[PDB]
Amino acid sequence: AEAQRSQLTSECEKLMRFLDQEERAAFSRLEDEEMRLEKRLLDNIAALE
Amino acid sequence: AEAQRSQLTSECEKLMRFLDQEERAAFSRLEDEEMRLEKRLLDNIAALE
Amino acid sequence: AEAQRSQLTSECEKLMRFLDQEERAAFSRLEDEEMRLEKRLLDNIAALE
Amino acid sequence: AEAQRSQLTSECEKLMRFLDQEERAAFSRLEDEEMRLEKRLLDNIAALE
Secondary structure (H helix, E strand, C coil): CHHHHHHHHHHHHHHHHHHHHHHHHHHHHHHHHHHHHHHHHHHHHHCCC | CHHHHHHHHHHHHHHHHHHHHHHHHHHHHHHHHHHHHHHHHHHHHHCCC | CHHHHHHHHHHHHHHHHHHHHHHHHHHHHHHHHHHHHHHHHHHHHHCCC | CHHHHHHHHHHHHHHHHHHHHHHHHHHHHHHHHHHHHHHHHHHHHHCCC
């Protein structure tokens, strides 16, 4: 049982850490797109008068 | 000139606030997708033995 | 054993969901502080000439 | 006037980009703290039986 509980707990941790990395990267990528969005909009507004 | 500077500054602020809202919503939506991702993966792992 | 594995898996899920909520709230709160930061800085810059 | 508008627009852009960097870093740092939080909690739960 302790064998199981030790294993299932460590599986939980590994799962959570994997998801943390995937999520941290997905964030970075969103921030990248948002910065491109801000640039286009600022330029589009500057061009209008 | 002061008329301009007052106007262009306020335009900056409004732009930044708009982008803040759009970005805050895009975040929420990402967090939603990530939670669905975690659920599917956890279920897929639980089903394997 | 299946009793254990079912229980430990569900504990994993509940832990992950709890952390998801706590983290989503911590984000919201950061975004709040960042918006206050942008306001102060914009005002401080506008005041300088 | 065009001199002003060109300058104030570029100031807007630089401000927004600076805040983007500061904010992206503040995020990274939060994600770091959250990962430490998850580790402590998981360990604290594993220790209880």
